[PDB]
Amino acid sequence: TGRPEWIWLALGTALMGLGTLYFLVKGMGVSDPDAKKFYAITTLVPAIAFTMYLSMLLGYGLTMVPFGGEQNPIYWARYADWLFTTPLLLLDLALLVDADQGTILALVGADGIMIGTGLVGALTKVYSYRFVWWAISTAAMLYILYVLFFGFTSKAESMRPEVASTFKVLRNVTVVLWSAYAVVWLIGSEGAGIVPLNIETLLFMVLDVSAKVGFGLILLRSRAIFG
Numbered sequence: 130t131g132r133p134e135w136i137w138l139a140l141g142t143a144l145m146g147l148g149t150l151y152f153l154v155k156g157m158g159v160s161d162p163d164a165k166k167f168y169a170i171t172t173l174v175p176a177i178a179f180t181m182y183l184s185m186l187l188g189y190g191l192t193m194v195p196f197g198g199e200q201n202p203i204y205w206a207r208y209a210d211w212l213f214t215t216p217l218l219l220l221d222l223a224l225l226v227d228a229d230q231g232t233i234l235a236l237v238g239a240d241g242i243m244i245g246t247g248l249v250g251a252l253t254k255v256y257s258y259r260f261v262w263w264a265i266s267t268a269a270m271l272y273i274l275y276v277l278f279f280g281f282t283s284k285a286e287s288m289r290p291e292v293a294s295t296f297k298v299l300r301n302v303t304v305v306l307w308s309a310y311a312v313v314w315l316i317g318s319e320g321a322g323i324v325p326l327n328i329e330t331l332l333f334m335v336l337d338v339s340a341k342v343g344f345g346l347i348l349l350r351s352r353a354i355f356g
């Protein structure tokens with residue numbers, strides 16, 4: 130086929146792979162029980178993204194959804210990636226501040242709704258309703274971010290400065306990157322169709338890679354992961 134966005138898919142596949150092996154290698158040398166935990170979670174994140182990026186590079190995870198009088202290309206493999214990578218990222222953050230089980234369950238549950246309605250909206254055939262689903266998905270995301278900013282940050286204050294300061298950064302990178310996803314979707318292929326697919330794929334790989342390998346590098350190179 131040779132679609133305009135393949136080069137960005139090939140670049141995302143590459144970055145996720147390198148980041149995966151590096152974390153995997155760095156993670157299996159570590160003996161600390163707790164550090165091992167964070168390593169297993171942070172390595173798995175780019176591993177899942179890598180395979181999904183690879184699948185898309187190879188022509189899977191794409192479907193034509195009709196609406197707006199057009200046959201629109203929707204990369205659904207993206208939601209198969211995020212369904213597992215986003216809750217894992219939330220988990221990494223919850224383990225850092227010693228979040229309570231109740232908080233985690235609700236964060237992952239909220240996360241499940243976000244991706245679910247997100248995909249339903251990306252698949253919806255009535256244009257206007259695509260935004261209803263989008264809206265719900267976004268509201269779910271703001272809830273998650275609110276918890277991370279008001280809840281978590283508060284509990285990270287019962288931690289050492291080193292741990293509280295590693296969280297602030299990861300929390301900040303997450304609030305900026307996650308917010309961005311909602312806007313890309315809205316003005317992109319799933320939404321208004323203002324931004325072309327090739328550029329949209331570029332925006333998504335930059336957010337995906339920053340949010341996984343970027344996040345992982347910051348987290349795994351810190352000593353706050355030690356028990």
Ligand SMILES: *C/C=C(C)/C=C/C=C(C)/C=C/C1=C(C)CCCC1(C)C
Pocket residue numbers: 178211214215218243244247248263266267270306307308310311314337340341
């Ligand atoms: C590695 C992937 C990460 C960190 C992905 C984060 C993805 C989001 C925060 C996605 C959010 C979305 C919305 C707020 C609404 C519309 C649909 C989504 C799923 C693109």
